[PDB]
């Protein structure tokens, strides 16, 4: 990020917590009380469901 | 590995070959962020110039 007046260097570690997380935490899915995820498929108009 | 296996069994498969290009040497430029900030130069300027 920046280097101070002395040799000290300010990395992004020093000002934040970097972790690999979801884009949005709004939606949470459970299957029988277990953590899970899924896809909700919506059929296109004028298409056969089967 | 698959090409080796297909080199075996020449009675069935013939002329197998990649459709693409093999890896070629490339020139890699490593910009030292610490040195770049030590001078007044900015990464955007370096990349734009290059």
Task: State the gist of this model.
With 50 residues, chain A is mainly beta. Chain A is 0% helix and 20% strand.
Word description of this protein:
Chain A is mainly β and 50 residues long. Chain A has no helices and 4 strands. The first copy, chain A, has strands at 2-3, 9-10, 29-31, 34-36. Chain A has a two-stranded antiparallel ribbon with strand order 1-2. Chain A has a two-stranded antiparallel sheet with strand order 3-4. In chain A, strand 3 and strand 4 (34-36) form a beta hairpin. Chain A is elongated and about 70 Å long. Chain A starts with a strand and ends in a 14-residue tail after the last strand. The interface between A and B is small, with 3 and 3 residues.
Radius of gyration of chain A: 23 Å
The proportion of residues in beta strands of chain A is 15-25%
> Percent range for helical residues of chain A?
under 10%
Strand line-up of the largest beta sheet of chain A: 1-2
Largest sheet of chain A: 2 strands, antiparallel
Largest interface here, residues on each chain? A-B, 3 and 3 residues
Task: List how many beta strands of chain A DSSP finds.
Answer: 4
Order of helices and strands of chain A: EEEE
Class computed from helices, strands and strand pairing of chain A = mainly beta
Descriptors:
Klebsiella pneumoniae, part of a larger assembly, membrane protein, two-stranded antiparallel ribbon, 50 residues, 2 chains, mainly beta, two-stranded antiparallel sheet
